[PDB]
């Protein structure tokens, strides 16, 4: 449970704490391959995986490691709902 | 759901008419539950078919 929702100014430090990456590229999706690009507005490094419990390369497809981030695939494998938080 | 209303003069004050299709669509999970409880349907595909 919870109560007493607060409102305040956002600190740059707490803004960093909120974020999961540094968006740096303006473009969103490549016209050739239809996956979000690095440092883009939909990048898997920052916002999460496109498919639930999957990574960019498919190095790990099993439904077992839900928090581990692969070596080649730095995009942590997790549930697709995480693109909302 | 919604529909045009119609006066029902044979209705008691506590009740209202409801079309067969609207009632069947709205109460679909209840119908599925009762069908499974009575055993008339085994799989939900059979219940949907009925």
């Amino acid at each position: 449970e919870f109560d007493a929702i607060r409102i305040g100014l956002a600190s740059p430090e707490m803004i960093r704490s909120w974020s999961f990456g540094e968006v740096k590229k303006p473009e969103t999706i490549n016209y050739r391959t239809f996956k979000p690009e690095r440092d883009g507005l939909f990048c898997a490094k920052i916002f999460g995986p496109v498919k639930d419990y999957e990574c960019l390369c498919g190095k790990y497809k099993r439904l077992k490691h839900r928090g581990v981030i692969c070596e080649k695939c730095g995009v942590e494998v997790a549930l697709a709902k995480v693109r909302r938080e | 759901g919604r529909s045009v209303i119609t006066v029902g003069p044979t209705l008691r004050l506590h009740q209202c008419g409801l079309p067969k299709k609207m009632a069947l669509e709205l109460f679909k999970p209840f119908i599925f539950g009762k069908l499974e409880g009575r055993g008339m349907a085994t799989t939900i595909k059979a219940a949907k078919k009925m």
Partner: protein
């Protein structure tokens, strides 16, 4: 009865054509509040819409024939929280 919902806010779409449900807007919510009926209002704005983990569990309960209605928290409030945060003003809870 149940169907696809909007992708941003997990609410049923609108209009025969997209299936869709009628909206308990502000006035109908006020009408329910004027009645003492709070459980149907809470289930109406919580279980019938805007809750992912609530809809499926309520469907389960209806199929098994028990009406428990585990509440959860609407997804639209989460969307509001993230929008206000993206406006650069902090939101939290006192737990």
């Amino acid at each position: 009865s149940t169907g696809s919902y909007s992708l941003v806010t997990q609410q049923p779409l609108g209009g025969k054509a997209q299936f869709g449900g009628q909206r308990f807007g502000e006035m109908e919510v006020w009408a329910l509040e004027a009645y003492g009926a709070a459980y149907t209002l809470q289930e109406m704005l919580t279980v019938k819409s805007d809750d992912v983990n609530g809809r499926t569990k309520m469907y389960k309960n209806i199929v098994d024939g028990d009406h428990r209605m585990e509440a959860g928290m609407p997804e639209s409030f989460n969307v509001l929280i993230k929008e206000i945060r993206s406006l650069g003003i902090d939101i939290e809870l006192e737990t």
